[PDB]
Write a protein that binds this DNA or RNA. Structure first.
Ligand SMILES: [Mg+2]
Ligand SMILES: [Mg+2]
Ligand SMILES: [Mg+2]
Ligand SMILES: [Mg+2]
Ligand SMILES: [Mg+2]
Ligand SMILES: [Mg+2]
Ligand SMILES: [Mg+2]
Ligand SMILES: [Mg+2]
Ligand SMILES: [Mg+2]
Ligand SMILES: [Mg+2]
Ligand SMILES: [Mg+2]
Ligand SMILES: [Mg+2]
Ligand SMILES: [Mg+2]
Ligand SMILES: [Mg+2]
Ligand SMILES: [Mg+2]
Ligand SMILES: [Mg+2]
Ligand SMILES: [Mg+2]
Ligand SMILES: [Mg+2]
Ligand SMILES: [Mg+2]
Ligand SMILES: [Mg+2]
Ligand SMILES: [Mg+2]
Ligand SMILES: [Mg+2]
Ligand SMILES: [Mg+2]
Ligand SMILES: [Mg+2]
Ligand SMILES: [Mg+2]
Ligand SMILES: [Mg+2]
Ligand SMILES: [Mg+2]
Ligand SMILES: [Mg+2]
Ligand SMILES: [Mg+2]
Ligand SMILES: [Mg+2]
Ligand SMILES: [Mg+2]
Ligand SMILES: [Mg+2]
Ligand SMILES: [Mg+2]
Ligand SMILES: [Mg+2]
Ligand SMILES: [Mg+2]
Ligand SMILES: [Mg+2]
Ligand SMILES: [Mg+2]
Ligand SMILES: [Mg+2]
Ligand SMILES: [Mg+2]
Ligand SMILES: [Mg+2]
Ligand SMILES: [Mg+2]
Ligand SMILES: [Mg+2]
Ligand SMILES: [Mg+2]
Ligand SMILES: [Mg+2]
Ligand SMILES: [Mg+2]
Ligand SMILES: [Mg+2]
Ligand SMILES: [Mg+2]
Ligand SMILES: [Mg+2]
Ligand SMILES: [Mg+2]
Ligand SMILES: [Mg+2]
Ligand SMILES: [Mg+2]
Ligand SMILES: [Mg+2]
Ligand SMILES: [Mg+2]
Ligand SMILES: [Mg+2]
Ligand SMILES: [Mg+2]
Ligand SMILES: [Mg+2]
Ligand SMILES: [Mg+2]
Ligand SMILES: [Mg+2]
Ligand SMILES: [Mg+2]
Ligand SMILES: [Mg+2]
Ligand SMILES: [Mg+2]
Ligand SMILES: [Mg+2]
Ligand SMILES: [Mg+2]
Ligand SMILES: [Mg+2]
Ligand SMILES: [Mg+2]
Ligand SMILES: [Mg+2]
Ligand SMILES: [Mg+2]
Ligand SMILES: [Mg+2]
Ligand SMILES: [Mg+2]
Ligand SMILES: [Mg+2]
Ligand SMILES: [Mg+2]
Ligand SMILES: [Mg+2]
Ligand SMILES: [Mg+2]
Ligand SMILES: [Mg+2]
Ligand SMILES: [Mg+2]
Ligand SMILES: [Mg+2]
Ligand SMILES: [Mg+2]
Ligand SMILES: [Mg+2]
Ligand SMILES: [Mg+2]
Ligand SMILES: [Mg+2]
Ligand SMILES: [Mg+2]
Ligand SMILES: [Mg+2]
Ligand SMILES: [Mg+2]
Ligand SMILES: [Mg+2]
Ligand SMILES: [Mg+2]
Ligand SMILES: [Mg+2]
Ligand SMILES: [Mg+2]
Ligand SMILES: [Mg+2]
Ligand SMILES: [Mg+2]
Ligand SMILES: [Mg+2]
Ligand SMILES: [Mg+2]
Ligand SMILES: [Mg+2]
Ligand SMILES: [Mg+2]
Ligand SMILES: [Mg+2]
Ligand SMILES: [Mg+2]
Ligand SMILES: [Mg+2]
Ligand SMILES: [Mg+2]
Ligand SMILES: [Mg+2]
Ligand SMILES: [Mg+2]
Ligand SMILES: [Mg+2]
Ligand SMILES: [Mg+2]
Ligand SMILES: [Mg+2]
Ligand SMILES: [Mg+2]
Ligand SMILES: [Mg+2]
Ligand SMILES: [Mg+2]
Ligand SMILES: [Mg+2]
Ligand SMILES: [Mg+2]
Ligand SMILES: [Mg+2]
Ligand SMILES: [Mg+2]
Ligand SMILES: [Mg+2]
Ligand SMILES: [Mg+2]
Ligand SMILES: [Mg+2]
Ligand SMILES: [Mg+2]
Ligand SMILES: [Mg+2]
Ligand SMILES: [Mg+2]
Ligand SMILES: [Mg+2]
Ligand SMILES: [Mg+2]
Ligand SMILES: [Mg+2]
Ligand SMILES: [Mg+2]
Ligand SMILES: [Mg+2]
Ligand SMILES: [Mg+2]
Ligand SMILES: [Mg+2]
Ligand SMILES: [Mg+2]
Ligand SMILES: [Mg+2]
Ligand SMILES: [Mg+2]
Ligand SMILES: [Mg+2]
Ligand SMILES: [Mg+2]
Ligand SMILES: [Mg+2]
Ligand SMILES: [Mg+2]
Ligand SMILES: [Mg+2]
Ligand SMILES: [Mg+2]
Ligand SMILES: [Mg+2]
Ligand SMILES: [Mg+2]
Ligand SMILES: [Mg+2]
Ligand SMILES: [Mg+2]
Ligand SMILES: [Mg+2]
Ligand SMILES: [Mg+2]
Ligand SMILES: [Mg+2]
Ligand SMILES: [Mg+2]
Ligand SMILES: [Mg+2]
Ligand SMILES: [Mg+2]
Ligand SMILES: [Mg+2]
Ligand SMILES: [Mg+2]
Ligand SMILES: [Mg+2]
Ligand SMILES: [Mg+2]
Ligand SMILES: [Mg+2]
Ligand SMILES: [Mg+2]
Ligand SMILES: [Mg+2]
Ligand SMILES: [Mg+2]
Ligand SMILES: [Mg+2]
Ligand SMILES: [Mg+2]
Ligand SMILES: [Mg+2]
Ligand SMILES: [Mg+2]
Ligand SMILES: [Mg+2]
Ligand SMILES: [Mg+2]
Ligand SMILES: [Mg+2]
Ligand SMILES: [Mg+2]
Ligand SMILES: [Mg+2]
Ligand SMILES: [Mg+2]
Ligand SMILES: [Mg+2]
Ligand SMILES: [Mg+2]
Ligand SMILES: [Mg+2]
Ligand SMILES: [Mg+2]
Lengths: 109, 102, 115, 55, 141, 150
RNA sequence: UGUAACGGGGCUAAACCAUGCACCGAAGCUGCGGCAGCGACGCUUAUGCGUUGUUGGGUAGGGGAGCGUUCUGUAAGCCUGUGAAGGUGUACUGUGAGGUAUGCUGGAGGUAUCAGAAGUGCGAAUGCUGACAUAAGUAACGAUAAAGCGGGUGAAAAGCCC
RNA sequence: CCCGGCGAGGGGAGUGAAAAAGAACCUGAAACCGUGUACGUACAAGCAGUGGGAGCAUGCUUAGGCGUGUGACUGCGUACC
């Protein structure tokens, strides 16, 4: 089994979340869950909740067993950006992109 | 074993048995050709030439195929002078299998 | 009769971007950049069919000049020696013989030495 | 100010080569409870060096 | 029909020694660069380093015609604000006698990865002794 | 196009492409450069050319044997069932039944039949004579067409 | 700014003057294929050739012959849930615009031939609209009046409540 | 049902012919951003290709080699309008 879980429309850019996701890749689920406790980043909380989902996801529905589970594929795709106007000096306007990310985790054995 | 001969305005260092691609001949698909334009024959003793061609040396071969080569694209283009041109080219060939270095 | 041109244009761009396959950066991705690369490639290809025939002759001539000087004759004198003995064998083969069958090659240098 | 012409994926990546942040890989274990935590930090429950020093 | 090219793995490279005592710098350097490149060999391929390893010994005794012992100058820039250094042919032999043959050959080799690869082949020495006895380097003239 | 003649922005000063109108055909949602006007595509044909063409096509039907000349051709009552049933004996399907005396009974009875068409001898056409696979002319209709084409 | 007035190495011949055969050397010329334009032409036949000369760099520009697109007639025909258009690959094929067949996706339209008509082909117009990059996880987070700690609530508290 | 904050969001289960038809809903191109496999890449100078070409990796017929991807080294080569 593979057993996917994923946060879609996760409020944080890919480039930031992708920094955390590179820590956990082909690591044992129990070891991965620890790291994100002591990774001082917003995205670590956001990625943890997906992994922690994927494990229960895996154990309830399909595979069972927590000990033999590795994060086989983790990836972050860029989601829809939300456009907002930032007014600047001298009358001109900018467009801030409130970005989002699609975080996926796959917990196989 | 190997011998040298001239065919399609060019020469080939050919051995007995192996296939050779050369320039198109006015010959049927599965007939036979005799080259009496043999330039050299090598063995233990080498029969080289102090004249054009050997003497009684004849390379006998059998025609295998009559295909067309890979499509070469030709692109002419004059920078800034509103001129370019396209042209394909597939050259005709004749594969021949050698069957007698005399 | 209005004519939408999305189907045909795509097929035009996709054709060129297929030739640009392998190129670095935008040159493989971006029609506007690729199209230049693909023409330039054509231009260089056209010129290099001319240069291939030159390069190989230099290559052969060097090989022949090397293999001759092992037997004690320079290229210039060797070729005149062969021409004066009415030998019709070309550089392409002399260069092939030079590498493969030196015991044979030696006989051409002797044949040239006569003249 | 201002780039002369736009940099690539490649350079953007080359620059980001050092942005990859390092993991801890150095979790402790409390002598009494056996709870994992950062070195020289207290635990989540409230232990340090096998002795309660917090309500 | 695809003409022969020398395959690096199959290249059997040979070792040589050249005594440069009383040899003309350039006329030596040429014959060295011809060998290092592998032109003398009948399996010469321009994109492969087919040439031979050469040991040039007694580099300091190399001869030069005319007034080039004093008059020939070897300029070089330090890459600095105004740092153009020069050294005459005597001054060069007094300090670094290896550099003389090195520079003369390097100018006559091609410029690039392979040109630098075929310079590595060359082994220059001031003295008459060489520590490459292990290769049985044969005598060349 | 609906919209004002006003320049959206001024000629110089802003780092933008000089515009003069929202309605310009290079802009979106306004223009079409050479907008079509309702027009008449009807083209002149010389009487002698039209007659010559009819004389040409109507004579090729005789060579190809599409032209089936007949005597009196008329259905009993205004019913398609009868017309369809009588064409089975005649061995026809896609036809142009030309008649001098245009019977309403025959007309009505071929209105619903797709491959059959019942023109009057006066109202023969170039495209029709070519289009249909056979042409059935009444002896009176041949006499009228003869005089009409002349 | 750096040798910096042989392109360099380097050379007393690898310079110069004279003669002499060699060789290298271009898309020049010849060799062997293949295509096309014009002129003859045997007189085949209104044409291609036993053929035969000759030509075939090209901006502005002039003259020829074609490809493809949407639509109308041929078509209430033909191909299509035993899988259309579209998308995406692969393999053939033509001198080119292109064409043909088929794998996957798609889930319903498509259209031979020969004619007809064009909103008929885009890389540029500081073109117009939408999308997405770059700089960059950079600058900045808006007055230098100032915070601190305990408790509460909460999944979470520097900011909320006391 | 299950993870989550009796959230968002997901995994199941089910409906349907189909749910990468699940409401951000036919098709779903390109730019652009990713994850995994093969090769190359940390002494090497420039329109980034092009002729040449080793190696390595795959597909095949095999007791020759020929495709495909990569492209070390090397001759030539200053984009388009
Ligand atoms: Mg949000
Ligand atoms: Mg973050
Ligand atoms: Mg299941
Ligand atoms: Mg986006
Ligand atoms: Mg603001
Ligand atoms: Mg401001
Ligand atoms: Mg303003
Ligand atoms: Mg204001
Ligand atoms: Mg073209
Ligand atoms: Mg339409
Ligand atoms: Mg496209
Ligand atoms: Mg186009
Ligand atoms: Mg594509
Ligand atoms: Mg490629
Ligand atoms: Mg490649
Ligand atoms: Mg693309
Ligand atoms: Mg691509
Ligand atoms: Mg692609
Ligand atoms: Mg040649
Ligand atoms: Mg600029
Ligand atoms: Mg990176
Ligand atoms: Mg950084
Ligand atoms: Mg050079
Ligand atoms: Mg309006
Ligand atoms: Mg006005
Ligand atoms: Mg006004
Ligand atoms: Mg401006
Ligand atoms: Mg703009
Ligand atoms: Mg509108
Ligand atoms: Mg409009
Ligand atoms: Mg318009
Ligand atoms: Mg228009
Ligand atoms: Mg009119
Ligand atoms: Mg008109
Ligand atoms: Mg009238
Ligand atoms: Mg009337
Ligand atoms: Mg009909
Ligand atoms: Mg200066
Ligand atoms: Mg100076
Ligand atoms: Mg200089
Ligand atoms: Mg000066
Ligand atoms: Mg001066
Ligand atoms: Mg020079
Ligand atoms: Mg100088
Ligand atoms: Mg010179
Ligand atoms: Mg000279
Ligand atoms: Mg001469
Ligand atoms: Mg030539
Ligand atoms: Mg030629
Ligand atoms: Mg010519
Ligand atoms: Mg012929
Ligand atoms: Mg010819
Ligand atoms: Mg003449
Ligand atoms: Mg002409
Ligand atoms: Mg001319
Ligand atoms: Mg012309
Ligand atoms: Mg036409
Ligand atoms: Mg057309
Ligand atoms: Mg067409
Ligand atoms: Mg077509
Ligand atoms: Mg079509
Ligand atoms: Mg139609
Ligand atoms: Mg018909
Ligand atoms: Mg029909
Ligand atoms: Mg049928
Ligand atoms: Mg049918
Ligand atoms: Mg059917
Ligand atoms: Mg079905
Ligand atoms: Mg079926
Ligand atoms: Mg079927
Ligand atoms: Mg349609
Ligand atoms: Mg299709
Ligand atoms: Mg498509
Ligand atoms: Mg798709
Ligand atoms: Mg298919
Ligand atoms: Mg389906
Ligand atoms: Mg339907
Ligand atoms: Mg319908
Ligand atoms: Mg049609
Ligand atoms: Mg037409
Ligand atoms: Mg048409
Ligand atoms: Mg129209
Ligand atoms: Mg248009
Ligand atoms: Mg344009
Ligand atoms: Mg466009
Ligand atoms: Mg174009
Ligand atoms: Mg243009
Ligand atoms: Mg624009
Ligand atoms: Mg534009
Ligand atoms: Mg910066
Ligand atoms: Mg910075
Ligand atoms: Mg900074
Ligand atoms: Mg700052
Ligand atoms: Mg500020
Ligand atoms: Mg501030
Ligand atoms: Mg503030
Ligand atoms: Mg202030
Ligand atoms: Mg204030
Ligand atoms: Mg404050
Ligand atoms: Mg406070
Ligand atoms: Mg506090
Ligand atoms: Mg509290
Ligand atoms: Mg509390
Ligand atoms: Mg609490
Ligand atoms: Mg509560
Ligand atoms: Mg909690
Ligand atoms: Mg939150
Ligand atoms: Mg507090
Ligand atoms: Mg505050
Ligand atoms: Mg407050
Ligand atoms: Mg307070
Ligand atoms: Mg919960
Ligand atoms: Mg809550
Ligand atoms: Mg719950
Ligand atoms: Mg809630
Ligand atoms: Mg809820
Ligand atoms: Mg809920
Ligand atoms: Mg829900
Ligand atoms: Mg929902
Ligand atoms: Mg969901
Ligand atoms: Mg689901
Ligand atoms: Mg389901
Ligand atoms: Mg089900
Ligand atoms: Mg079911
Ligand atoms: Mg069913
Ligand atoms: Mg479907
Ligand atoms: Mg489906
Ligand atoms: Mg399914
Ligand atoms: Mg299902
Ligand atoms: Mg489903
Ligand atoms: Mg699903
Ligand atoms: Mg499913
Ligand atoms: Mg689908
Ligand atoms: Mg889904
Ligand atoms: Mg599917
Ligand atoms: Mg579907
Ligand atoms: Mg919607
Ligand atoms: Mg969407
Ligand atoms: Mg979607
Ligand atoms: Mg629909
Ligand atoms: Mg539908
Ligand atoms: Mg969709
Ligand atoms: Mg896609
Ligand atoms: Mg895409
Ligand atoms: Mg991309
Ligand atoms: Mg990318
Ligand atoms: Mg490597
Ligand atoms: Mg690698
Ligand atoms: Mg390496
Ligand atoms: Mg170095
Ligand atoms: Mg390296
Ligand atoms: Mg560089
Ligand atoms: Mg360069
Ligand atoms: Mg390349
Ligand atoms: Mg290449
Ligand atoms: Mg190549
Ligand atoms: Mg290879
Ligand atoms: Mg291999
Ligand atoms: Mg390559
Ligand atoms: Mg290396
Ligand atoms: Mg190179
Ligand atoms: Mg260059
Ligand atoms: Mg240039």
């Amino acid at each position: 089994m593979e057993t996917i879980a994923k946060h879609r429309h996760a409020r944080s850019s890919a480039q930031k979340v992708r920094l955390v996701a590179d820590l956990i890749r082909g690591k044992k689920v129990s070891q991965a869950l620890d790291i994100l406790t002591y990774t001082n980043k917003k995205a670590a909380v956001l990625v943890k909740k997906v992994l922690e989902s994927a494990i229960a996801n895996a154990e309830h529905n399909d595979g069972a067993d927590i000990d033999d589970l590795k994060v086989t594929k983790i990836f972050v795709d860029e989601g829809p950006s939300m456009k907002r106007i930032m007014p600047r000096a001298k009358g001109r306007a900018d467009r801030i992109l409130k970005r989002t990310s699609h975080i996926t985790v796959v917990v196989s054995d | 074993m190997y011998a040298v001969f001239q065919s399609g305005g060019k020469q080939h260092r050919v051995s007995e048995g192996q296939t050779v691609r050369l320039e198109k001949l006015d010959i049927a698909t599965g007939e036979t050709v005799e080259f009496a334009e043999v330039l050299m024959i090598a063995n233990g003793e080498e029969v080289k030439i102090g004249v054009p061609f050997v003497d009684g040396g004849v390379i006998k071969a059998e025609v295998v195929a009559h295909g067309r080569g890979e499509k070469v694209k030709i692109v002419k283009f004059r920078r800034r002078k509103h001129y370019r041109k396209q042209q394909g080219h597939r050259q005709w060939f004749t594969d021949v299998k050698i069957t007698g270095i005399s | 009769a209005r004519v939408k041109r999305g189907v045909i244009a795509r097929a035009r761009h996709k054709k060129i971007l297929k030739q640009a396959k392998g190129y670095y950066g935008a040159r493989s991705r971006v029609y506007r950049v690729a199209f230049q690369a693909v023409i330039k490639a054509g231009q260089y290809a056209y010129r290099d069919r001319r240069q291939r025939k030159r390069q190989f002759r230099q290559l052969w001539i060097a090989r022949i000049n090397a293999a001759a000087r092992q037997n004690g004759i320079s290229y210039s004198k060797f070729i005149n020696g062969l021409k004066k003995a009415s030998v019709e064998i070309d550089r392409k083969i002399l260069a092939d013989i030079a590498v493969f069958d030196k015991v044979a090659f030696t006989a051409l240098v002797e044949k040239a030495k006569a003249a | 100010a201002v780039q002369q012409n736009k940099p690539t994926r490649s350079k953007r990546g080359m620059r980001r080569s050092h942005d990859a942040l390092t993991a801890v890989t150095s979790l402790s274990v409390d002598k009494t409870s056996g709870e994992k935590h950062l070195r020289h930090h207290i635990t989540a429950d409230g232990y340090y060096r096998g002795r309660k020093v917090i309500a | 029909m695809k003409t022969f090219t020398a395959k690096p793995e199959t290249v059997k490279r040979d070792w040589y020694v050249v005594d440069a005592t009383g040899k003309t710098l350039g006329r030596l350097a040429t014959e060295l660069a011809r060998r290092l490149r592998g032109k003398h060999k009948a399996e010469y391929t321009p994109h492969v380093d087919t040439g031979d390893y050469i040991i040039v010994l007694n580099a300091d005794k190399v001869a030069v015609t005319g007034n080039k012992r004093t008059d020939k100058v070897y300029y070089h820039h330090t890459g600095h604000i105004g740092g153009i250094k020069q050294a005459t042919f005597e001054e060069m032999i007094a300090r670094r006698p290896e550099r003389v043959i090195e520079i003369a050959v390097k100018g006559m080799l091609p410029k690039g990865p392979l040109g630098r690869a075929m310079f590595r082949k060359l082994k220059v020495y001031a003295g008459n002794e060489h520590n490459h006895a292990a290769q049985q380097p044969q005598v060349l003239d | 196009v609906t919209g004002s003649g006003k320049k959206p922005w001024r000629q110089k000063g802003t780092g933008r492409a000089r515009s003069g109108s929202i309605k310009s055909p290079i802009w979106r949602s306004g223009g079409v450069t050479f907008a079509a006007r309702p027009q008449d595509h009807s083209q002149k044909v010389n009487k002698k050319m039209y007659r010559g063409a009819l004389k040409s096509i109507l004579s090729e039907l005789v060579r190809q044997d599409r032209l089936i000349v007949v005597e009196k051709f008329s259905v009993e009552a205004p019913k398609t069932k009868l017309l369809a049933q009588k064409l089975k004996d005649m061995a026809l399907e896609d036809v142009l039944i030309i008649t001098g005396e245009l019977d309403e009974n025959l007309f009505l009875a071929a209105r619903n039949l797709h491959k059959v068409d019942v023109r009057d001898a006066t109202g023969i056409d170039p495209v029709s004579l070519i289009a249909f696979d056979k042409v059935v002319m009444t002896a009176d209709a041949v006499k009228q067409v003869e005089e009409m084409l002349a």
